[PDB]
Design a protein around this nucleic acid. Structure first.
Ligand SMILES: [Mg+2]
Ligand SMILES: [Mg+2]
Ligand SMILES: [Mg+2]
Ligand SMILES: [Mg+2]
Ligand SMILES: [Mg+2]
Ligand SMILES: [Mg+2]
Ligand SMILES: [Mg+2]
Ligand SMILES: [Mg+2]
Ligand SMILES: [Mg+2]
Ligand SMILES: [Mg+2]
Ligand SMILES: [Mg+2]
Ligand SMILES: [Mg+2]
Ligand SMILES: [Mg+2]
Ligand SMILES: [Mg+2]
Ligand SMILES: [Mg+2]
Ligand SMILES: [Mg+2]
Ligand SMILES: [Mg+2]
Ligand SMILES: [Mg+2]
Ligand SMILES: [Mg+2]
Ligand SMILES: [Mg+2]
Ligand SMILES: [Mg+2]
Ligand SMILES: [Mg+2]
Ligand SMILES: [Mg+2]
Ligand SMILES: [Mg+2]
Ligand SMILES: [Mg+2]
Ligand SMILES: [Mg+2]
Ligand SMILES: [Mg+2]
Ligand SMILES: [Mg+2]
Ligand SMILES: [Mg+2]
Ligand SMILES: [Mg+2]
Ligand SMILES: [Mg+2]
Ligand SMILES: [Mg+2]
Ligand SMILES: [Mg+2]
Ligand SMILES: [Mg+2]
Ligand SMILES: [Mg+2]
Ligand SMILES: [Mg+2]
Ligand SMILES: [Mg+2]
Ligand SMILES: [Mg+2]
Ligand SMILES: [Mg+2]
Ligand SMILES: [Mg+2]
Ligand SMILES: [Mg+2]
Ligand SMILES: [Mg+2]
Ligand SMILES: [Mg+2]
Ligand SMILES: [Mg+2]
Ligand SMILES: [Mg+2]
Ligand SMILES: [Zn+2]
Lengths: 109, 213, 51, 169, 117, 112
RNA sequence: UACACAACCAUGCAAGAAGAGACAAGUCGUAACAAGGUAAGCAUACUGGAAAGUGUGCUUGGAUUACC
RNA sequence: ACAGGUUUGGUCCUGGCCUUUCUAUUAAUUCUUAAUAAAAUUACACAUGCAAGUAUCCGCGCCCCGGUGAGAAUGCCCUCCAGAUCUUAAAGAUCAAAAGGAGCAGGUAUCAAGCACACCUAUAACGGUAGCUCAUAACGCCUUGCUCAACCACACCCCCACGGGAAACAGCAGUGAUAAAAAUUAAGCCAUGAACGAAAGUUUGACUAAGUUAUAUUAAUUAGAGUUGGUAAAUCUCGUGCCAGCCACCGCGGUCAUACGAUUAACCCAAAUUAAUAGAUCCACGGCGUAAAGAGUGUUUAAGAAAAAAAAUCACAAUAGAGUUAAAUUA
């Protein structure tokens, strides 16, 4: 690009960051609509605990429940974050452990 | 400021004309504007209460028009004084009424605006000025047999020093300013007081429009 | 003062320009004296050929 | 920079090292030069090198170039009073044009010193405020005065809470 | 910002520290905030004494008398600082306050004398 | 001497664009503006309306405009002072002779 | 005082239609990669369950192994 | 950027993603005291309290302080200033409306035409010219306070506020709804600012001094959090066995798992530690035969370079018309 072309085009500006599944918020309070189990991609083999929830923004999205063992049914209010799970395609949210209806991971006694 | 997409605001300019018409059409008359509830010391028009120091002169004195409504020609050339002037100023301070315009809407005829000649502390002004604080309850009328006796004033000279020593730092400023130029004059610097004459707070201020020359 | 000095320098450069233009005019006359004698040869041969 | 023939002339240092400041009367500079002939070489090099240096220090003066209009290169200054200053340049070099323009219509060293000496007066050392306009923000940072309670805590006898606790009893 | 009225006033802008005041003697509009926009900063006043026990007061007299001759109003602490500096006469409020302090001392000495017996 | 103009362009030099308006010339003034990134000066044009009371400037004239003390309209705030270079008819300001580009129409070495 | 007055658009839902992509094991073929077993591909037209086939020009991002 | 990890059986080049640095909010875990700074979800609706008074009557002030960022690409900077205010005889000084412009100024040209946006007479009326802006981005659409001693805009809404909805905290405290987002319905004008008064003086939810809050820094009275496969500092023994589960990228788990859960030990921070989201920073003065890129071709407008001198034109199948046919083939 010559000097005339660079002056006609102007200096390049960096694009703004596109909003993710959380619409730019750190967390989102949503009600659990349905708890189920999904399977990972080709190399891995497991049964991940997922849940379809209705976020506070009115959007219905899938999240992943971390830790081993959980007590989450329908009509449970949980807090989700923008943590994306690598094995599950399309699932880009994660339930925060230690919230209204999602308690911490209990030790097996 | 000046932009190509400015909007032609017409309602803001219409409301100015409406409010300007309302100001002159519903202009409150001074008779009910300066009314007074002598029991609670509260103005019925505006709703303000008189100060505590004015409670005695309202119940024990009268205003200018209240003693001017009983005169043949509304006091043309007459002299009127004030209680505060008779109390503070031992010198004769009066008002020579040249014209009076009372309000006709009053049922008792005790309000109005007038002009006159002011003679404060004996000094007579040769200009026509509107009299101030007419609704005040301090005016007093002097009878006819004392018109020449009350005006008797002895023109005495003032004893104010015409020159005053400067403050210390400002005087040293001149003592060091003129020294550097080679001026060996050790004369004491004085501060002028001719153009520093100030009228007391009892001197009424004019109400006419000041003309820019 | 500076404007008068600038006018004087302009007139000095104008005189130098006039001298240079006279020299170039003489060089141009020499070029005309070369091209006339070349064109006089090139003209008569074509007329002789067409004759 | 890298693009261009002489990349040095597209830097802040080359634009700032040109010491040609016109007077307050100069408004327009029309430079008329040619693109052929060995004579206008100095005017072509002037337009190539010094024009940005003059335009950097004279942002309000209009500068207009005209190519292949007249057989002789020249400059034409249009002042505020209406006077037109015609400058002839036929065999002058690049530096001779700069020094001749600075001689005819420029600012002397004595003139350029007093403007910056008056500009220096605006920033007063004894003033206080933000770091952008003044040298000190919180008078606490003066070596002799009371320290800044955000750095050194004040003693007990000076705080308003202790004062209002003594005033209570 | 644009105002309907107001007047130029030489006052003290309390731009300082918590439990540690420091006034900037500036000439600003009377309708402007205390620590807001000003026209020209004149001087600075340190209310707290330094290690030498001095309250540093700094006045730009050359601009103070200029703004006063241009029509700048003055506040009570500004007139107090000018009276203590000697550029302006001593304020009648400072004189009466000193008289009142002397009378308080004259009352306390007699109270402390009548208390001992 | 109470005659001032609130515009910044007291004197400007430009080219005539159009003369379709009656007694009004459309002048294109070109200045040099520095690029904040490339640090190179580029030509920025600007349209200026000028009043030609004589209707003499044609399309292509290098003309000087002077700031009118009062704007006649909201667009005409200048006036034609002098036609610096007439299109096709250029007079060399240094020699005083008509010139056609680089060649002299009448040589200055022949006074008579 | 005399006229158009939800026309024009934005945000959600929609009976439905179509496409793209992901998803560790499905059916039918084998199109391409080796002269991939008819050398590939481009534009374009027609045809065929499907990859695709064919026609007219074009390219080598194919060889013709080089006293053959 | 002093860089590092990552494409492949492998190497080089091109090229994207992530890590390492700093800051702010929220969440989880933990938590001892002080000082300073800051208190930040809401232009959605508000119970209650206070926030404009002064003064011998008149008058003067009463979004001025303070609050907010909804709208506007608004605007930054620069000339001229009407008008208002303070002291004077005039003249001076502050704020400075409106009118503009040297220049600069978010994205989008998949917004390319706008549709009356211009000019002269002499008067403030008639008339005559056919103009004006725009690829150097007009006219549109979307988003947004800001370039900060500060500036701009709004004050329930209808851009305005006669009028109509309709009874207004985008003042200080507090309350509902909402949200991941959680300061006291507290004391005074002692100091400063503002208003009044000639003045002593009064008022001031501005402000001052406090209360609450690990949001940040410092001092100590305080010790918990994260991690231990590579990037990248640091693991011993058990249990599970592509299950449970873990990860920022590579990826690890099917029988000796330093990668999962627990224990020991170790590493790094520390009254904080991690996670998430926003930021600051980061693309090209680099390239276009094979990776993305030379637009199928020529001419011209705008625009740009002419920086030292030279030249233009010849066998052969350019192209468009009219006429003809040697070989082969066929009715
Ligand atoms: Mg994760
Ligand atoms: Mg919890
Ligand atoms: Mg503070
Ligand atoms: Mg094939
Ligand atoms: Mg084969
Ligand atoms: Mg095949
Ligand atoms: Mg086959
Ligand atoms: Mg094949
Ligand atoms: Mg092949
Ligand atoms: Mg094809
Ligand atoms: Mg076929
Ligand atoms: Mg066939
Ligand atoms: Mg091949
Ligand atoms: Mg590859
Ligand atoms: Mg929190
Ligand atoms: Mg009042
Ligand atoms: Mg504000
Ligand atoms: Mg808009
Ligand atoms: Mg003015
Ligand atoms: Mg202005
Ligand atoms: Mg589109
Ligand atoms: Mg907004
Ligand atoms: Mg409104
Ligand atoms: Mg509200
Ligand atoms: Mg309010
Ligand atoms: Mg509140
Ligand atoms: Mg609440
Ligand atoms: Mg908070
Ligand atoms: Mg709460
Ligand atoms: Mg709470
Ligand atoms: Mg909580
Ligand atoms: Mg209180
Ligand atoms: Mg106070
Ligand atoms: Mg007070
Ligand atoms: Mg902290
Ligand atoms: Mg882990
Ligand atoms: Mg094991
Ligand atoms: Mg790890
Ligand atoms: Mg482990
Ligand atoms: Mg690149
Ligand atoms: Mg390519
Ligand atoms: Mg090509
Ligand atoms: Mg193509
Ligand atoms: Mg044909
Ligand atoms: Mg036939
Ligand atoms: Zn401090």
């Amino acid at each position: 690009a010559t000097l005339n072309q660079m002056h006609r085009l102007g200096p390049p500006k960096h694009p703004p960051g596109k909003m993710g599944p959380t619409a730019g918020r750190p967390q989102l309070k949503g009600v659990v609509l349905r708890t189920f189990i999904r399977k990972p991609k080709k190399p891995n083999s497991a049964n991940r605990k997922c849940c379809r929830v209705r976020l506070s923004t009115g959007r219905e999205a899938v999240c992943f429940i971390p830790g081993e063992g959980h007590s989450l049914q329908e009509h449970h209010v949980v807090l989700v974050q923008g943590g994306r799970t690598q094995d599950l395609p399309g699932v880009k949210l994660t339930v925060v452990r230690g919230k209204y209806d999602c308690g911490h991971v209990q030790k097996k006694k | 400021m000046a932009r190509k997409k400015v909007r032609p605001r017409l309602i803001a300019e219409l409301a100015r004309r409406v409010r300007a018409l309302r100001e002159q059409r519903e202009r409150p008359r001074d008779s009910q504007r300066y009314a007074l509830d002598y029991e609670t010391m509260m103005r019925p028009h505006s709703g303000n209460r008189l100060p505590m120091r004015a409670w005695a002169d309202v119940r024990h004195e009268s205003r200018l028009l209240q003693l001017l409504n009983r005169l043949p020609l509304f006091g043309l050339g007459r002299l009127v004084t004030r209680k505060s002037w008779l109390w503070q100023h031992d010198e004769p301070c009066y008002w020579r009424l040249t014209r009076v315009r009372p309000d006709y809407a009053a049922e008792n005829l005790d309000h109005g605006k007038a002009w006159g000649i002011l003679t404060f502390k004996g000094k007579t002004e040769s200009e026509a000025r509107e009299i101030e604080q007419v609704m005040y309850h301090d005016w007093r009328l002097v009878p006819k047999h004392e018109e020449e006796a009350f005006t008797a004033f002895t023109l005495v000279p003032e004893d104010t020093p015409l020159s005053v020593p400067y403050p210390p730092l400002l005087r040293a400023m001149i003592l060091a300013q003129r020294q550097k130029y080679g001026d060996t004059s050790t004369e004491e610097p004085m501060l002028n007081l001719e153009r520093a004459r100030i009228d007391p707070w009892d001197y009424p201020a004019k109400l006419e429009a000041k003309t820019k020359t | 003062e500076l404007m008068a000095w600038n006018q004087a320098e302009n007139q000095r450069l104008h005189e130098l320009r006039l001298a240079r233009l006279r020299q170039e005019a003489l060089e141009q006359e020499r070029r005309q004296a070369e091209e006339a004698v070349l064109q006089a040869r090139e003209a008569q041969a074509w007329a002789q050929l067409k004759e | 920079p890298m693009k261009g023939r002489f990349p040095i002339r597209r830097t802040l240092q080359y634009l700032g090292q040109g010491d040609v400041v016109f007077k307050d009367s100069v408004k327009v500079m029309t430079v008329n030069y040619n693109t052929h002939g060995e004579l206008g070489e100095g005017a072509r090099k002037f337009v190539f090198f010094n024009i940005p240096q003059i335009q950097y220090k004279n942002p309000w003066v209009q500068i207009t170039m005209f190519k292949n209009m007249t057989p002789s290169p020249f400059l034409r200054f249009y002042l505020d009073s209406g006077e037109q200053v015609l400058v002839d340049v036929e065999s002058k070099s690049n530096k001779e044009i700069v020094e001749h323009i600075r001689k005819i219509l420029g600012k002397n060293e004595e003139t350029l010193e007093k403007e910056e000496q008056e500009k220096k007066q605006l920033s007063h050392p004894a003033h206080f405020g933000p770091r952008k306009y003044c040298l000190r923000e919180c008078m606490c940072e003066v070596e002799g005065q009371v320290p800044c309670p955000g750095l050194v805590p004040l003693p007990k006898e000076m705080t308003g809470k202790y004062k209002a606790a003594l005033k209570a009893t | 910002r644009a105002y309907r009225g107001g007047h130029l006033t030489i006052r003290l802008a309390l731009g300082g520290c918590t439990n540690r005041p420091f006034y900037r003697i500036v000439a600003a509009h009377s309708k402007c905030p205390r620590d807001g926009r000003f026209v020209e900063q004149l001087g600075s006043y340190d209310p707290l004494p330094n290690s030498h026990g001095e309250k540093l007061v700094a006045l730009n007299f050359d601009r103070i008398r200029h703004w006063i001759g241009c029509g700048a109003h003055l506040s009570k602490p500004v007139e107090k600082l000018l009276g203590l500096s000697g550029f302006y006469p001593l304020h009648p409020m400072m004189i009466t306050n000193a008289e009142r302090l002397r009378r308080k001392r004259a009352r306390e000495v007699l109270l402390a004398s009548q208390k001992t017996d | 001497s109470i005659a001032r103009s609130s515009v910044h362009a007291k004197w400007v030099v430009g080219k005539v664009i159009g003369t379709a308006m009656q007694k009004t010339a459309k002048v294109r003034v070109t200045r040099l503006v520095l690029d904040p990134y490339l640090l190179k000066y580029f030509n920025k044009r600007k349209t200026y309306f000028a009043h030609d009371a004589l209707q003499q400037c044609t399309v292509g004239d290098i003309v000087l405009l002077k700031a009118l003390p009062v704007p006649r309209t909201k667009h005409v705030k200048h006036e034609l002072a002098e036609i610096i270079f007439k299109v096709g008819q250029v007079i060399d300001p240094v020699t005083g002779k008509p010139c056609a580009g680089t060649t002299y129409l009448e040589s200055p070495i022949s006074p008579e």
